[PDB]
Design a binder for this molecule. Structure first.
Ligand SMILES: CC(C)CCC[C@@H](C)[C@H]1CC[C@H]2[C@@H]3CC=C4C[C@@H](O)CC[C@]4(C)[C@H]3CC[C@]12C
Ligand SMILES: CC(C)CCC[C@@H](C)[C@H]1CC[C@H]2[C@@H]3CC=C4C[C@@H](O)CC[C@]4(C)[C@H]3CC[C@]12C
Ligand SMILES: Cc1ccc(-c2ccc(F)cc2COc2ccc(CCC(=O)O)cc2)cc1
Ligand SMILES: Cc1ccc(-c2ccc(F)cc2COc2ccc(CCC(=O)O)cc2)cc1
Ligand SMILES: [K+]
Ligand SMILES: [K+]
Ligand SMILES: [K+]
Ligand SMILES: [K+]
Ligand SMILES: [K+]
Ligand SMILES: [K+]
Ligand SMILES: [K+]
Lengths: 412, 412
């Protein structure tokens, strides 16, 4: 027997990488109807693959909530499970790119079946050696019924996908219906490990923050030949020619880091994460993945006022979507504060107002910039930049600002 | 005050991404002297940037060993520190690509100075609020001397790099000498947080395992137009045309996952990690980063026997270098087992032989394949594939094999 914490941390790292894999085609899209259609398709594929990989990650998290402690064989089986999961984005992209070809849907169904079969092997091994189970399962007298329930839950998806794979040769629409039913059944018809949620969130945030510097380190180191021919041997000029990329990276890193800061602060006060909090966290991460695209678009900065106005609106919308779901997590937690939140941030608690301000800082700023874009259109672009400067400072001075507001309302 | 564990986990994730960033140019190198020179330059740059980012990560780890507990201001300062660190690979690549241009060396020195200045701000803030310090520092009466020592250690590198930046305008070789002195002084003239080492290692392993699938998901989804024109509308043929990439990914993921399995097993029994163990871990990770290149080269599989023999030798050498340093970590730990290892894996312990076999499995296999390449040249290539099949199975049956060997030696 061994402690399973590090194995699950490795699983979370791999799964965050796999979930965010499909954001690279979006950010590498150079950017007339054809280009817009291509970008929309890529964004939709990214969202769907992120959600699918998140569903797989959640299934893994609760599977290894059932399995309390790990073992060499369990570690190798988990490696096999991760290997199978790493193919979901590619097979899904292949299926959507070739909807009418049965081979793509068959490959996706095979990937899902393989994940389920490896997880069923893990469940069988763990139940054959009860000391690997959680104490709740170990001490229960209905271990056989627990095994049946867990194994049925694990193998539900594989059965539906196997039926879909069969039907692909006869009636494709029913195959797609079964694939969607796979995701529908678990949620249309419990707590989630807070550590797993935190690890997955940290991985996603770390990847999204550094996407643009990863692009820069590969593409934007000047070529000495190009420097000597096109910039008259001036390295400073060659580096200035690529300024917009650096500005995009700075903005994206700052925004993603501050959103992670808000998430970190929120989860420092969470006692237990519910399923609703997990769903809202998934939505927030999915929309967070899109910030690099927003900042690329705004940094490119086509001089046309209408184009730049559209870019600012899109960026503000993306930031609002990223942060409103964190605020929604916090509001959902407040409904069951007694069991979900530490007493510090309960209604009327010491740090309740500070947490509220910290989580509402970004949605308010994004909404204000978006409104300025409609009311103060000419200044709006500058206002957007002002936002990028104001929000970080507000985070530094947040306690002083909250105290000032409290003192002001004391008399008012 | 807040718990600093999640902030440091996020730092480890970001730092692993930044350390492994420069491996992408290596794996994206399509592969006459010019190509070899380009590949050698890219590999050297990757190694140097990995080592530099690891030095920065180690400095960060011990800085936040000094700082016991975190705070909102400390969290934001840490975000700024990570932002500064993310520019080390790009500035180093720019400096090496333009060695004679003072601007590149100046930018690298500025990045180093900025990292040091942010860390000095963190130290000053933590010491101005002693409750953020570790209890050892808090209870000491020499907190002023501790502050002086820590601040000097933090600002050592910035001073040397500032001198180098000045000298770049007058005598460049002395500037380079000072830059190397920055790294020389700390090591030429203590324990390391095992959690930080584990998190960094897991991040690096997770990135390296999935490099090739990240490439595949972007580049190798067939284009319907290409499928219809070049493969006569056969999607299976189009997918078979890209088989070697999938084989390379399978091999690379299996090898990296099993090396991580060996690392995980080793560190499950480590009580405290010393500086020597940290250095050996860094070397092992640096050489692990090169496995995707080895497997790409072997999967490309030019039919020429000499070329394939060279590619098998290179792959075996890379695997041996990756795993021998894990074995060296284990051997170094055995020298101070009493304080470094759990009693289970001490000399003559219950699991000592199993740990030895687990860590020596890969070096022995790689050395045997390399030797077969010289003695059994014609079969060697097949033997390499045999290795890819044998080592995983040996990991599954490792306990049975160890028991069999013990029983055999009982009579012999
Ligand atoms: C053929 C390979 C490539 C992939 C598909 C594997 C097949 C044989 C597996 C995957 C999941 C399995 C199913 C999982 C659960 C159940 C429910 C049980 O009450 C009857 C058997 C049934 C319906 C299984 C039959 C076999 C099954 C469909
Ligand atoms: C100019 C900007 C862009 C970058 C460089 C910042 C300069 C001013 C900073 C960076 C590190 C600093 C040094 C850090 C440590 C010491 C040792 C002390 O006994 C004398 C001052 C001295 C030598 C500092 C002088 C100022 C310094 C060199
Ligand atoms: C109905 C059905 C059909 C097929 C499969 C199946 C098939 C292939 C496969 F690889 C794994 C599985 C499932 O994996 C196990 C299931 C049970 C057991 C032990 C039994 C116990 O005591 O509960 C061990 C492993 C399962 C159930
Ligand atoms: C000799 C020298 C020269 C320059 C700098 C410097 C310069 C710029 C900068 F941003 C930060 C620093 C260093 O950051 C601090 C140092 C001390 C203090 C408080 C003093 C205490 O009580 O020890 C707080 C912050 C430091 C030492
Ligand atoms: K973690
Ligand atoms: K991670
Ligand atoms: K990553
Ligand atoms: K990448
Ligand atoms: K971790
Ligand atoms: K990581
Ligand atoms: K290309």
């Amino acid at each position: 027997i061994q402690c399973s914490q590090r194995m699950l941390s490795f699983s979370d790292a791999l799964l965050s990488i796999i979930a965010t894999v499909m954001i690279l085609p979006v950010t590498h899209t150079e950017i007339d109807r054809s280009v817009q259609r291509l970008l929309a398709t890529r964004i939709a594929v990214y969202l769907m693959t992120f959600l699918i990989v998140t569903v797989a990650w959640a299934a893994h998290t609760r599977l290894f909530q059932v399995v309390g402690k790990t073992d060499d064989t369990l570690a190798l089986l988990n490696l096999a499970c991760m290997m199978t999961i790493t193919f979901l984005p590619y097979t899904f992209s292949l299926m959507v790119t070739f909807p009418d070809v049965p081979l793509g849907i068959f490959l996706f169904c095979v990937c899902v079946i393989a994940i389920g079969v490896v997880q069923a092997l893990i469940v069988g091994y763990a139940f054959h050696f009860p000391h690997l189970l959680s104490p709740q399962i170990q001490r229960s007298a209905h271990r056989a019924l627990y095994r049946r329930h867990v194994l049925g839950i694990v193998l539900q998806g594989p059965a539906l996908c196997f039926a879909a794979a069969i039907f692909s040769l006869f009636f494709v629409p029913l195959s797609y219906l079964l694939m969607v039913t796979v995701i529908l059944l678990p949620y249309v018809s419990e707590p989630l490990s807070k550590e797993r949620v935190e690890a997955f969130s940290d991985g996603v945030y770390a990847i999204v923050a550094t996407l643009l510097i990863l692009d820069i380190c590969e593409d934007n180191v000047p070529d000495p030949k190009d420097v000597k021919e096109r910039f008259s041997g001036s390295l400073v000029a060659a580096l200035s020619a690529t300024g917009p990329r650096f500005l995009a990276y700075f903005g994206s890193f700052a925004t993603v880091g501050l959103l992670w800061f808000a998430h970190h602060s929120l989860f420092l006060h969470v006692r237990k994460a519910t399923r609703a909090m997990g769903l809202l966290n998934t939505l927030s991460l999915a929309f967070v993945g899109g910030l690099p695209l927003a900042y690329q678009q705004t940094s490119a900065f086509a001089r046309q006022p209408r184009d730049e106005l559209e870019r600012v609106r899109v960026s503000c919308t993306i930031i609002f979507l990223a942060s409103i779901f964190q605020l929604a997590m916090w509001t959902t937690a407040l409904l069951h504060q007694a069991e979900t939140l530490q007493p510090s941030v309960w209604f009327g608690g010491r740090e309740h107002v500070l947490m509220f301000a910290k989580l509402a800082l970004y949605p308010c700023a994004s909404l204000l910039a978006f409104a300025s874009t409609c009311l103060l259109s000419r200044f709006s672009v500058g206002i957007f930049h002002l936002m990028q400067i104001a929000v970080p400072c507000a985070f530094l001075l947040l306690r002083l600002l909250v105290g000032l507001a409290l003192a002001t309302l004391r008399v008012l």
